[PDB]
Design a protein around this nucleic acid. Structure first.
Length: 340
DNA sequence: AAAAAAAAAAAAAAAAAAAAAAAATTTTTTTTTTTTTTTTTTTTTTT
């Protein structure tokens, strides 16, 4: 938790040295991605993205710049056919992370997510009760069935995902609650099935205003592949008859405790070129167009990868990995700049 | 047929009109009984 991470004496020197060795290990990224959800079969990219979400970028103090508050959290949207294990991944993250909240489909409401007023039935006094987005203030909110979220409540997510703030101005109480959450959402393509004729956006059916907030979108699509089907069946049957959580937890805690990656000059130039190329690619008709929110997303992902590496300095390796992850997500490589 | 807007309802919170509940010893009077005094009646003593 946040308090345990803040406390100085959370790790012995031996544990610190062991974690630093694990970091100097060259495949620590893939090791941790595989460790996450150990019983989810080869979702390497999705697991890597979720790991980056857990690690999170750097907290930045832009108060002196009069710019506002920058969201260091990473948001992920798993757009996939029902039965693609997106709900399983959502539940795994929900049960794994402290300060985790879970909502699904039409079971939520704008007031119930933001806040409301009730009558505390022990003091007989009217008090204010938070919602899921506030209870997950410094953690994660998992929104399953993210498409059955009638806009009345989906509108609330704009403020949360943009400025980490929830400005409530009701009859009696005016305030702005901190909602510095990370959103992991699950969406089903229209008709509950991905038409292999409509483009990515036409299938997702989410407004660009919202989709540009998610700094990672994974298309859980099913390739009709013999090897994949056979190995998946083997794994699923193996579950029917038969890294450590400790090291993973300690690694994440140490990373949050004393890792604050900072952009280097080379990484800055790489990010500039990455954003220009990404915008050029996304200019296509039906693809997910890239706005400067995507440069922000690339910075976030690069910082998260640097934190995973414990570098403390964001590097061209990290920015390139952010490029690769954001590109493999949405299947940009596998989609032509005209059709899906 | 699906999404958004409108409204319609349900339930909960709040503020008066009427009804219902709570809180409450002390002073003065009179009656009885008992005693004291007056006069009449009766008794006793002296011539």
């Amino acid at each position: 938790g946040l308090d345990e991470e803040a406390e100085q004496k959370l790790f012995s020197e031996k544990r610190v040295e062991l974690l630093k060795e694990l970091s100097r290990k060259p495949d620590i990224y893939e090791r941790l991605a595989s460790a996450l959800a150990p019983s989810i079969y080869e979702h390497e990219d999705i697991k890597k993205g979720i790991l980056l979400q857990l690690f999170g970028g750097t907290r930045k103090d832009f108060s002196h710049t009069g710019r506002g508050k920058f969201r260091a959290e990473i948001n992920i949207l798993l757009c996939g056919d029902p039965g693609t294990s997106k709900s399983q991944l959502l539940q795994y993250v929900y049960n794994l992370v402290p300060r985790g909240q879970y909502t699904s489909g039409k079971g939520s409401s704008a007031v119930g997510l933001t806040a409301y007023v009730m009558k505390d039935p022990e003091t007989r006094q009217l008090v204010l009760q938070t919602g899921a987005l506030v209870l997950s203030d410094n953690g994660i909110c998992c929104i399953d069935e993210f498409d059955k979220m009638n806009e009345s409540t989906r509108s609330v997510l704009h403020e949360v995902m943009e400025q980490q703030t929830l400005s409530i101005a009701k009859a009696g109480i005016i305030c702005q609650l901190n909602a510095r959450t990370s959103v992991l959402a699950a969406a089903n393509p229209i008709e509950s099935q991905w038409n292999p004729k409509k483009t990515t956006i036409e299938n997702i059916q989410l407004p660009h205003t919202l989709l540009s907030r998610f700094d990672l979108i994974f298309l859980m699509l099913d390739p009709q592949d013999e090897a994949y089907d056979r190995r998946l069946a083997h794994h699923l049957v193996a579950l029917y008859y038969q890294l450590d959580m400790a090291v993973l937890k300690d690694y994440i805690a140490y990373a949050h405790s004393t890792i604050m990656p900072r952009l280097s000059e080379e990484a800055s130039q790489a990010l500039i070129e990455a954003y220009v190329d990404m915008r050029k690619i996304g200019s296509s008709r039906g693809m997910v167009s890239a706005y400067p929110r995507q440069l922000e997303s690339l910075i976030r992902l690069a910082e998260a990868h640097a934190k995973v590496r414990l570098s403390n300095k964001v590097e061209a390796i990290d920015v390139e990995e952010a490029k690769r992850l954001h590109r493999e997500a949405l299947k940009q490589s596998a989609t032509d700049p005209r059709t899906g």
